Design an enzyme around this catalytic site. Structure first.
Site, PDB file in Angstrom:
ATOM      1  CB  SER A 142       0.071  -3.387  11.908  1.00 50.25           C
ATOM      2  OG  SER A 142       0.321  -2.288  10.991  1.00 50.25           O
TER       3      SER A 142
ATOM      4  CG  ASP B 283       4.009  -5.082   5.916  1.00 48.05           C
ATOM      5  OD1 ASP B 283       3.544  -5.962   6.615  1.00 48.05           O
ATOM      6  OD2 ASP B 283       3.577  -3.910   5.956  1.00 48.05           O
TER       7      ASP B 283
ATOM      8  CG  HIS C  44      -0.494  -5.400   6.897  1.00 49.31           C
ATOM      9  ND1 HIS C  44       0.714  -4.913   7.354  1.00 49.31           N
ATOM     10  CD2 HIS C  44      -1.460  -4.763   7.604  1.00 49.31           C
ATOM     11  CE1 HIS C  44       0.485  -4.020   8.305  1.00 49.31           C
ATOM     12  NE2 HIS C  44      -0.821  -3.905   8.465  1.00 49.31           N
TER      13      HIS C  44
END
Ligand SMILES: *[C@@H]1O[C@H](CO)[C@@H](O)[C@H](O)[C@H]1NC(C)=O
Length: 356
Positions: A146, A254, A300
């Site tokens: 991330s 995502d 994710h």
């Protein structure tokens, strides 16, 4: 609880609240491979939203409550059953306590309520690890998920330059950016930047850079120039400027990309076309990325999840693809691919997608 905390000896390199930054380390003696993983967790970009993050996400702004150990999971696991790729490596987890996508170079001071030192934290961790065995490394893989994945893209070439300047030109620096490859695309529904939730990442990042004293890689900075450095936070624009080998892991759909696109999940035609176009755009941006793993799933992050081995693209898992990448960095390899991008157009059209 196999990685042990070390707070930085240079206590001028701090988390947001001025507490010392640090890293968690599990050494593997005799291994010359080092994995430095950058934690993620969004960002904050002004006083009010950083104050709110301090109230309810304080471990992402401070080391005062960090535990003395953490358990390595996924690619940070030392068990080959869980980590077929790099189980015997030296493992480092760098907590994200700077809220700046690993870009900041500013201290807390009379002008600044918070310190944003992400780029300096990485440099200081590398410097202190050199005296704990990193000086003997053959490969340093800077990985992250991330905001930490974007942080890989922003910092991998600076780590390479740092090691070269320190007299370690034999250490091969490489990047692994997981779930940090975002698009500055049209939102599904549109909000002007009038507060935190309405502010799209391009505007939030342009503000953040100024608030953080954010730094980007030099070649990308030279392309986009003053006031446009926010472009360098978008993988498809910064990647072509990088010299270090970077493997890109990105779900095609995502969840964080959908969030910043104001998509919240029966889907009607407008949203169906929006989602399909998002997957197509992501796939287009990866066409010429030779080391990539991009499954058609709504999810994710991947690399520090314990079940990271389960997903496959065209029958190849991510640990296998990373292994093939290592071989490629010793012409393509028979049955050992490194470019793995799904072509099917809808979340979970790949049957190996995470179940949730
Ligand atoms: C501590 O870190 C700061 C900020 O990166 C740097 O300017 C300084 O040289 C470092 N000091 C030592 C003793 O390493």
């Amino acid at each position: 609880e196999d990685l042990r905390l070390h707070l930085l000896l240079n206590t001028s390199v701090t988390c947001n609240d001025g507490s010392p930054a640090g890293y968690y380390l599990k050494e593997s003696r005799g291994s010359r491979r080092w994995l430095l993983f950058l934690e993620g967790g969004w960002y904050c970009f002004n006083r009010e939203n950083c104050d709110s993050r301090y109230d309810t996400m304080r471990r992402l702004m401070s080391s005062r409550d960090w535990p003395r150990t953490r358990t390595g999971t996924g690619i940070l696991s030392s068990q080959p059953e869980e980590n077929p790729y790099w189980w015997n490596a030296n493992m480092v987890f760098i907590p994200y306590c700077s809220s700046d996508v690993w870009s900041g170079a500013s201290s807390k001071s009379e002008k600044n309520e918070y310190a944003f030192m992400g780029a300096l934290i990485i440099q200081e961790v590398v410097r202190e690890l050199l005296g704990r065995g990193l000086s003997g490394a053959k490969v340093l893989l800077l990985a992250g998920s991330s905001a930490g994945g974007t942080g890989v893209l922003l910092n991998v070439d600076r780590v390479a330059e740092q090691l070269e300047k320190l007299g370690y030109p034999a250490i091969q620096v490489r990047g692994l950016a997981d779930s940090g490859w975002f698009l500055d695309n049209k939102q599904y529904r549109h909000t002007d930047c009038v507060d935190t939730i309405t502010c799209a990442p391009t505007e939030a990042i342009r503000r953040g850079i100024r608030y953080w004293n954010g730094v980007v890689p030099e070649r990308c900075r030279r392309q986009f120039q003053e006031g446009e450095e926010w472009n360098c936070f978008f993988g498809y624009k910064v990647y072509p400027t990088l010299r270090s080998p970077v493997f890109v892991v990105q779900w095609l759909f995502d969840e964080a990309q959908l969030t910043v696109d104001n998509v919240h999940l029966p889907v009607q035609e407008g949203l169906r076309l929006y989602i399909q176009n998002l997957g197509r755009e992501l796939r287009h941006t990866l066409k010429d990325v030779p080391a990539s793993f991009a499954p058609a799933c709504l999810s994710h992050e991947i690399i520090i999840r314990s079940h990271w081995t389960d997903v496959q693209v065209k029958g190849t898992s991510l640990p296998r693809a990373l292994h093939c990448w290592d071989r490629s960095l010793h012409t393509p390899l028979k049955g050992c691919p490194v470019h793995l991008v799904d072509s099917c157009p809808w979340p979970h059209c790949n049957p190996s997608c995470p179940t949730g």
